[PDB]
Amino acid sequence: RRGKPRPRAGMFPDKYRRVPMLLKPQQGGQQYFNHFLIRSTNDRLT
Amino acid sequence: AKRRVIVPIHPTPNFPAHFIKSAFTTDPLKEKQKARFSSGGEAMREVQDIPKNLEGERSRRDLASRGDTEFQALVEFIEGASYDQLISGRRFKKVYDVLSENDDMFIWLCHTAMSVLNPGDMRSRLIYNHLRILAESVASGEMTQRTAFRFFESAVRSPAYREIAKRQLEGGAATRLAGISAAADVMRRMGLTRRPMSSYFELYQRIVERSEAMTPWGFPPLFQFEERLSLEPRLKFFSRASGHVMTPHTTLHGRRIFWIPPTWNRAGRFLGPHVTLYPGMTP
Amino acid sequence: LKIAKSAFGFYLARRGQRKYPFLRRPHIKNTHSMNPSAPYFWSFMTAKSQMAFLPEENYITGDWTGKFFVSKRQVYTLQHATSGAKVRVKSFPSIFEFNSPSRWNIGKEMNTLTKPRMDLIDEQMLTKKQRLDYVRAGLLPK
Amino acid sequence: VGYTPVNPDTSPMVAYSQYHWHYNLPQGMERPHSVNRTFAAPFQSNHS
Amino acid sequence: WAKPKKRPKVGQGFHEKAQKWREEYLLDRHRALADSLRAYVEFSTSKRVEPWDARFKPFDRIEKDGVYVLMRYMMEEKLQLCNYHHRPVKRLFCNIGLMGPQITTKARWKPYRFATNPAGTSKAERMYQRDKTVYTHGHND
Amino acid sequence: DNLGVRRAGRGEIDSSPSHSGSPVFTQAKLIGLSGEEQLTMCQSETMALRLCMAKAGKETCERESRALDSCLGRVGHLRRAMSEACWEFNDWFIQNVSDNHTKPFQHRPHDWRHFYAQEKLVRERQQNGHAYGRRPKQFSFGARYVKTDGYGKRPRLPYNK
Amino acid sequence: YIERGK
Amino acid sequence: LVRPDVPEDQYVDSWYICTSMTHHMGDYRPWSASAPPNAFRFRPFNEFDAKGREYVQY
RNA sequence: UAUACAAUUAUCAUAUUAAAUUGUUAAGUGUUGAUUUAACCAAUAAAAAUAUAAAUAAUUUUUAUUUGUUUUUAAACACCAUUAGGUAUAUGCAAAUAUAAAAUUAUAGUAAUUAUAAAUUAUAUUAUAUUAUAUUUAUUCAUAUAAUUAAUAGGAUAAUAUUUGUAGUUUUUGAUACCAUGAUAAGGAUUAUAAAUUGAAAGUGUUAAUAUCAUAAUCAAAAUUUAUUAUUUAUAUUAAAUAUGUAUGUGUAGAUAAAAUAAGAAAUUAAAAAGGUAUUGUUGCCCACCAAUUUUUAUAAUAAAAAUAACGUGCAGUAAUUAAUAUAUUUAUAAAAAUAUAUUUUUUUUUUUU
Ligand SMILES: [Mg+2]
Ligand SMILES: [Mg+2]
Ligand SMILES: [Mg+2]
Ligand SMILES: [Mg+2]
Ligand SMILES: [Mg+2]
Ligand SMILES: [Mg+2]
Ligand SMILES: [Mg+2]
Ligand SMILES: [Mg+2]
Ligand SMILES: [Mg+2]
Ligand SMILES: [Mg+2]
Ligand SMILES: [Mg+2]
Ligand SMILES: [Mg+2]
């Protein structure tokens, strides 16, 4: 700050510290999981 | 120099003598130093470690009505999971101390078992009695550990000892089973522990851990026992113990157990430990 | 305050250059009160309506011995010019007199006829330091 | 501390002290007071 | 907080100087006022450049069509009476009604200081060539 | 709690173990982590890969870079192992060797003065028990060949002067 | 350093 | 936890001290005593959460 | 005034059973020129390697012998002076720490002691994992005035008070314009993620025991010099408390400001060894010359020594601004400084055939 050098980025608390771990990153696309499971299973038999 | 002057406060109906000498000083180079601590009835008994000397009917009433303190401690620590208490590190510390209380004697016995080449046949009632007596004298503080050890190794065994030792041993190292069986036996027959097994377990365990150490059964003579200068409790031998730019200024701000809670004279902006500034929505 | 120009120099703190809420500054110092406008001549620093009566201060209200200066919100009236009587106003250092009467003054308040901050500066009311600082700003010659 | 003394009603550092009633105790009236009933004064005005 | 130093005394004969200086500052201000009134009225009375910005519509259109037709035949007299001062010009356009909602919305007008130039103005420099001795607030030529 | 244990914690002020009184400040330099003489795990790899880079640009070999990055991937765990073993050495050295700064320095010549004395004494008894601490006068770069017959051409025993 | 005594 | 886990109505934010205290000295009633007997997620009524109760009522 | 060292280990000057002394080797020219040094100046540059055995132990060497000073530069280095030169290392003379001693100083009458070592004194490149400073936006910053701080006193719907209209000057002195102790500000630099705060004690006008020049206080309409302040930048512009006339100049010097927090930025870190003549400790102590005086005497430019609190030079010492200490020789305003040897009461940096 004042007539002194800025702290390195790692010297501040985490920027996203208040966002829950399930949000970073979002795991979306759950709808498809089951689909591909069946698919792969099917392919194995092929 | 314009030297500041302070006029003495005399004892007052609300301001007794000790309050005055402890909270007030007439010499103003000693102002703004720091906080002093003192102890009262129980915290004094903890810090001063006054061993109770035995006494009349009340003291034996309370030797017979005592029960298991090994257990009572455990219970009281557990009890912190009750709805109306927290779990304390102090309560835990008390449990720990009572469990690990057996290093002064168990440690000694470990030395007599593993630290001595050829301590005769340890099943024989003679050497056995030597060991028994010395043990009961390490407990109850009648002897130094060092003194009792040097007593043990210098104790009278049998005439022409070495030359009978040439008829059994090559390099003078006997087998260690008799030693451990005797050393457990003594702690059992003496009343050393409230629960019988603990003796044997600890004496065994402490040996097993040391088995992995470099030059395990030798010891430097100065650090081996009580002496002026000691090792730190981690390195003792058979011992049981073997943002970021502002958090100078955030030093109060987590969830903090306090001792003395801060007060508005001493803390300008702090709100208290229970406070949540950024609350999430919970059902 | 640094220098005490009045009693209040002792009582008041400056607080650096501090902000006050809109149009409330503790001390009413109207530097702008004489600030020439031809088109706004009758609306600027004067009565909001021309049907307002002249203020209290154009009238002799009670039994008077006499006054030293008349107030500065008094409005200059044809009689101020014509009657040829002393018209004084309290300005700094001491007092401003209207000596040379003109009809061009008429209908405005003496606030507006008296320049609060003169382009003229006394070198003798200034410390040598202050005189230096007035030379830096390019006011005093040196 | 000062030439102006604290006024004991408005100061919580008096009110809530050990010599008075803290705000976390149960706040009921301490004792009743019957003054006017026990010994009563007859009315005499200062004015006729 | 240091004790305030005392202010030096006023001056000798500075009361006379202040009296004289304010006196003739006021006498000067009379002519400055007279002159700026003359200027203000001379400006109100004299013609101005066209207020509308021709770069946009409906003004860009060739002078023989659209709004310019509407001006030459219906509004001309009035537009000249008010000397193309931008306020009455914009109002007249509102009241002619044959443009109607557009005057404020689609049409663009020159900025204040440019619209105030005297008719005949060729170079932009003119804004800065007007007299500074006169107190009209940019309402002088 | 740190009284009577004169050594303080570790990574801490007065944590250093001592050897015959002079403290041990070189520990990392021993296991060859972070020293100038430091042990290097993979050389042949890095040299091989450097050679590959310098030879030609028409063919690019990532085979070499794969052998190398394999090598490194192992090196990490190796190093953590060595460090751990070294801290165990610090512990052992403190228990069974170090005197905790209690014995006199052996590492500077004055500490050995008595030794040198024994030698001075000898050169004195050779001289008929006379000149102690005395040594032969240094002569000249070429004292032997610049001097005439009759003057000493080589430096004598001090007693002999 | 020389003047330090003042 | 800084203080016992109990319905917060039992706590008061202290004057002059940064800390909370209990408005009945040291007595504590568990969560179970706020709700009806065997109340799901101690709740005035088990059917809905607070908002659910509001809009059902509306 | 008299009134009981040690003799097992004690550092400055009274040595003593000892094998030495003597060795003729090396090195030197091609050519056109910035070497050495923190920096100056003179001005060819290369060089001088070998010896063990043996000598018997003690009892009358103490006026004897013996403890780093040395011919020859037509030979250098080195050192001293500064371009001119001096000097450049055991054939004269020369006992001398290696301890025989009785409290410090002092030529053996001076002052009353002295000397001494381990407490304490913040920076000497030791290691992955527990995860990022090199982005963005800013910078024309001004506002104070017209003197008297000293005590109580009740009214309708009340069982009767003119108490309607209650009348005893004058002996004290500080918060003042003025010396007159206390107490809360600002100021990011390593207790991290979970059910959680990015603001601190080290003190910023107004506050409680030092008094002994003075009425200085806003109730309007008022006088810029003060480090410590984010203003509106081109379609349309002064109506109610009176309310700012000035600086258009190629977003243009130097120098500066702010931020990782409901926003959106991502890759070049620290630990562990250290000294004090001071003693709440470097703003600490001390050292010599340079005046007065006091006192003893073995009177050397100007006697010596001891007490000592001025004045003036400096900055010698406490690893202390080129480390100190001892001897030697030289030098000199004064501590002292240069060189030649020994040495740590100076701080350490560490190849078991590469
Ligand atoms: Mg240390
Ligand atoms: Mg002698
Ligand atoms: Mg203060
Ligand atoms: Mg007043
Ligand atoms: Mg004399
Ligand atoms: Mg003398
Ligand atoms: Mg010095
Ligand atoms: Mg020196
Ligand atoms: Mg020095
Ligand atoms: Mg010396
Ligand atoms: Mg000198
Ligand atoms: Mg000397």
| Three-state secondary structure readout of chain B | CCCCCCCCCCCECCECHHHHHHHCCCCCCCCCCCCCCCCCHHHHHHHHCCCCCCCCHHHHHHHHCCCCHHHHHHHHHHHHHCCCCCCCHHHHHHHHHHHCCCCHHHHHHHHHHHCCCCCCCCCCHHHHHHHHHHHHHHHHHCCCHHHHHHHHHCCCCCCCHHHHHCCCCCCCCCCCHHHHHHHHHHHHHCCCCCCCHHHHHHHHHHHHHHCCCCCCCCCCHHHHCCCCCCCCCCCCCCCCCCCCCCCCCCCCCCCCCCCCCCECCCCCCCCCCCCCCCCCCCC
| Minimal Cβ distance to A18: which of B243, B244, B278 | B278
Contact F17, F94 (CB under 8 A): yes
Which window residues (43-102, chain B) lie with Cβ within 7 Å of strand I?
Answer: none
User: H21: which strand partners?
Assistant: H12
Question: Least CB-CB distance to H21: which of D12, D13, D24?
Answer: D24
Q: At H39, is the secondary structure helix, strand, or coil?
A: coil
Determine the distance from the C-alpha atom of residue B153 to the mean position of all C-alpha atoms in its chain, rounded to a whole number: 27
Angle between helices B104-114 and B197-210 (to 10 degrees): 60
Going by C-beta distance under 8 Å and a sequence separation of 6 or more, which residues neighbour residue B158?
B120, B164
For H29, other C-beta atoms within 10 Å of its C-beta total 14
What is the DSSP-derived secondary structure letter of residue F148?
A: P
Helices of type H across F18-151: 28-31, 44-55, 63-96, 113-125, 143-146
What tokens appear for E136 in the block?
């009209």
Alpha carbons C97 and C86: distance in angstroms, whole number:
7
Quote the ligand 8 centre to H52 CA distance (angstroms). Answer: 92
Peptide-bond breaks in chain B following residues (C–N over 2.5 A): 242
Task: Check if the beta carbon of residue B245 is closer than 8 Å to that of residue B238.
Answer: no
Residues from chain C that touch E33, judged by Cβ atoms under 8 A, are: 36, 38, 41, 104
As given in the structure block, the two tokens for residue E3 are: 């004790």
CB B8 within 8 A of CB B26: yes
Contacts of H21 (CB under 8 A, 6+ apart): D24, H11, H12, H14
For strand I, is any atom closer than 7 Å to the CB of F126? yes
Pairing relation of β-strands C96-98 and H11-13? unpaired
CA distance to B256, C75, C83, C120, C122, per residue, from C95 (Å): 69, 17, 20, 15, 16
CA–CA–CA angle C39, C40, C43 (5° rounding): 145
| Partner B contacted by F96 (CB < 8 A) | yes
Q: Is the CB of E110 under 7 A from strand I?
A: yes
Strands (E), E7-107: none
- Give the separation between CA B274 and CA B109, rounded to whole angstroms: 50
Q: Measured from the CB, is F91 under 7 Å from any atom of strand I?
A: no
- Alpha carbon distances (Å) from C32 to C36, C117, F80: 9, 9, 78
What distance, in Å, lies between the first and last C-alpha atoms of chain C? 28
Q: Is B262 on the interface with H (CB under 8 A)?
A: yes
Quick one: which H or E segment has residue E38? helix E14-45
Alpha helices (H) along C15-99: 78-82
Q: Which residues of chain E lie closer than 8 angstroms to C91, CB-CB?
A: 18, 22
- Resolution to 1 decimal place, in Å: 7.8
Size of interface C-E (CB pairs under 8 A): 102
Q: Between B and H, how many residue pairs show a Cβ–Cβ distance under 8 A? A: 52
CA A36 to chain centre: 21
The label of the residue with tokens 């006011």 reads: C139
Would you say E30 and C120 are in contact if contact means Cβ atoms under 8 Å apart? no
Query: Which two structure tokens, joined as six digits, stand for A12?
Result: 């501040």
Flag whether residue A12 sits within 8 Å of chain B, measured between CB atoms.
Answer: yes
Q: Which ligand is nearest to the CA of G4?
A: 7
Q: Are strands C87-89 and C96-98 parallel, antiparallel or unpaired?
A: antiparallel
**Angle (CA) E109 E114 E117, round 5°:** 120
Number of H helices, E strands in chain H: 1, 2
Which chain B residue shows the shortest CA-CA distance from H52? Answer: B283
Six token digits for residue E94: 């509102």
Instruction: In chain E, count H helices and then E strands.
Output: 6, 1
d(CA H22, CA H19): 10
Q: Test B272 with H18 for CB contact under 8 angstroms.
A: yes
Taking the C1' atom of every nucleotide in all shown strands and the CA of B273, the nearest one is I196
Report the distance separating Cα C76 and Cα C53, nearest Å: 13
Best C72, C86, C94, C127 residue to mutate vs chain E (most E CBs within 10 Å): C94
Best mutation target, B82, B84, B260, to test chain H (most H CBs within 10 A): B84
Please report, for chain G, how many H helices and E strands are present, in that order. Answer: 0, 0
Cα F148 off chain centre by: 49
E58 cis-preceded (ω within 30 degrees of 0): yes
Rounded to an integer, what distance in angstroms lies between the CA atom of residue F104 and that of residue F18? 11
Nearest 5°: the CA angle B174, B177, B178 is 80
Residue E32 Cβ < 7 Å to strand I:
no
| End-to-end Cα, chain H, rounded Å | 38
Phi, psi of B111 (to 5 degrees): -65, -45
- Round to whole Å and give the CA distance between C3 and E6: 6
Evaluate whether C50 touches C41 at the Cβ level (below 8 Å). no
> Residue B199 has which token pair?
């003796």
Q: Residue C50 is encoded by which pair of tokens? A: 């021309």
| Dihedral angle over CA of E24, E27, E31, E34, nearest 10 | 150
Q: What is the DSSP letter of F20?
A: T
Rounded to whole angstroms, the Cα distance separating B85 from B92 reads 14
Sign of the four-CA dihedral B227, B231, B233, B239: negative
E3 CA distance to ligand 4 centroid (A)?
Answer: 22
Chain I nucleotides reached by a protein CB under 7 Å: 15-26, 47-49, 66-73, 75-77, 88-91, 97-98, 126-128, 131-135, 141-147, 153-155, 158, 160-164, 166, 177-179, 181, 183-210, 216-218, 220-230, 234-246, 248, 256-264, 266, 269-274, 280, 282-286, 315-316, 321, 341-345, 347-350
Contacts with B239 (C-beta within 8 Å, 6 or more apart), sequence order: B103, B107, B233
Residue pointed to by tokens 């149009």? C23
Burial code (b: 16+ CB inside 10 Å, e: under 16) for F124-134 equals beeeeeebeee
Looking from the CA of D13 toward its CB, the CA atoms found within 13 Å total 8
| Element housing F18 (H / E) | strand F18-19
CB B108 within 8 A of CB B149: yes
Helix (H, G, I), strand (E, B) or coil at H21: strand
- Give the closest nucleotide to E108 (alpha carbon vs C1'): I235
Assess B83–A contact: CB distance below 8 Å, yes or no: no
The one-letter amino acid at C35 = N
Which of chain B's residues have a Cβ under 8 Å away from the Cβ of A9? none
* Dihedral angle over CA of E127, E128, E130, E136, nearest 10: 80
Residue whose token pair is 């002249």: C54
Strand partners, C109: C75
Distance CA F117, CA F112 (A): 9
Phi then psi for residue F55, to 5 deg, are: -65, -60
What DSSP line would sit under A1-46, residue for residue? Answer: --SSPPPPGGGS--TTTTS-GGGSS----HHHHHHHHHHHHHHHH-
Chains A and B touch (3+ CB pairs under 8 A): yes
Give the Å distances, CA to CA, from C70 to C45, C58, C59, C95, F1: 18, 9, 10, 10, 85
In this complex, do E14 and C93 lie within 8 Å of one another by their Cβ atoms?
A: yes
Closest CA to B151 of B119, B123, B177: B119
Interacting residues of A24 by C-beta distance below 8 A, sequence separation 6+: A16
Peptide bond into F23 cis (omega under 30): no
How far away is chain D from the Cα of H7, in angstroms, using its nearest Cα?
17
User: Taking Cα atoms as reference points, which of B224, B208, B219, B213 lies closest to residue B108?
Assistant: B224
Structural determination approach: cryo-EM
A5 touches chain B (CB under 8 A): no
The helix (H) or strand (E) run that includes residue E31 is helix E14-45
In chain D, the residue whose alpha carbon lies closest to the alpha carbon of H22 is D24
- How long, in residues, is chain H? 58
Helix axes B125-138, B177-189, angle to 10 degrees: 60
- CA dist E37 and E53 (Å) reads 30
C-alpha to C-alpha distance for B160 and C13, rounded to whole angstroms: 101
Strand I reaches within 7 A of the B35 CB? yes
* F133 alpha carbon – ligand 12 mean position (Å): 22
Q: Do you find a cis peptide bond into C36, omega within 30 degrees of 0?
A: no
Q: Is C25 exposed, middle or buried (0-12, 13-18, 19+ CB in 10 A)?
A: exposed
Residue E126 CA, ligand 3 centroid: distance in Å: 62
For residue D29, give the amino acid letter: M
DSSP F23: E
CA distance F72 to F70: 5
Query: Which of the nucleotides lies closest to F152 (Cα–C1')?
Result: I90
Residue C50's contacts (CB-CB under 8 Å, 6 or more residues apart) are C42
B267 touches strand I (CB under 7 A): yes
Handedness of CA H32, H38, H42, H43 (dihedral sign): negative
Classify residue C110 as exposed, middle or buried by CB count within 10 Å of its CB (0-12, 13-18, 19+).
Answer: buried
Other C-beta atoms lying within 10 Å of the C-beta of residue B229? 14
Spell out a b/e string for A24-41, using b for 16 or more CB atoms within 10 Å of the CB, else e.
eeeeeeeeeeeeeeeeee
Question: Which residues, in sequence order, are CB contacts of B238 under 8 Å at separation 6+?
Answer: B103, B106, B107, B110, B111, B206, B207, B210
The dihedral region occupied by F109, where left means phi > 0, alpha psi between -120 and 50, and beta the remainder, is alpha
Backbone phi and psi for residue B268, each to the nearest 5 degrees, phi listed first: -70, -60
The number of beta carbons lying within 10 Å of the beta carbon of residue C8 is 11
Rounded distance between C-alpha atoms, residue E137 and residue C36, angstroms: 9
Residue F48: strand, helix, or coil? helix
Distance of alpha carbon C75 from alpha carbon C91, whole angstroms: 16
Q: Whole-number Å distance, CA F142 to C1' I47? A: 9
How close is the nearest chain B Cα to the Cα of A22, in Å?
15
Query: Cβ distance C135 to C142 under 8 Å?
Result: yes
What residues contact residue B183 under an 8 Å CB cut-off, 6+ apart?
B109, B112, B113, B131, B203
C60-90: burial string, b at 16+ Cβ within 10 Å, e else: eeeeeeeeebbebebbbeeebbeeeeebbbe
Q: Which of B219, H31, B54, B170 is nearest to F96 (CA)?
A: B219
Burial of H34 (0-12, 13-18, 19+ CB in 10 A): middle
- Take residue C136 and report the two structure tokens written for it: 């830096």
- Given a contact cutoff of 8 angstroms between Cβ atoms, the answer to whether E115 and E109 are in contact is yes
Q: Give CA torsion, residues H41, H42, H47, H48, to 10 deg.
A: -80
Partner-chain contact F100 B229, CB within 8 Å? yes
* Separation CA H41–CA H35 (nearest Å): 9
Residue E50 is which amino acid?
A: E
At position E117, the amino acid (one-letter code) is: N
End-to-end Cα, chain F, rounded Å: 66
Q: Residue C142 is which amino acid?
A: K
* Helix/strand/coil for E48: strand
- Specify whether the CB–CB gap between H20 and H12 falls below 8 A: yes
Structure-token pair, residue B250:
């955030």
Cα distance from H41 to chain B (closest Cα, Å)? 9
Phi, psi dihedrals of residue A15, rounded to the nearest 5°: -60, -35
User: Which run of H or E residues covers position E15?
Assistant: helix E14-45
- CA C16 to C1' I142 (Å) is 11
Distance G4 CA to ligand 11 centre (A): 23
Question: Pairing mode, if any, of strands E5-6 and C3-4?
Answer: parallel
Q: Are C113 and E27 in contact (CB under 8 A)?
A: no
- Do F42 and F75 contact (CB within 8 A), yes or no? yes
Q: Can you give the length of chain B in residues? A: 283
Chain C residues lying within 8 Å of E36, measured CB to CB: 36-38
Residues in chain C: 142
Q: Which of C11, C27, C30, C6 is nearest to C112 (CA)?
A: C30
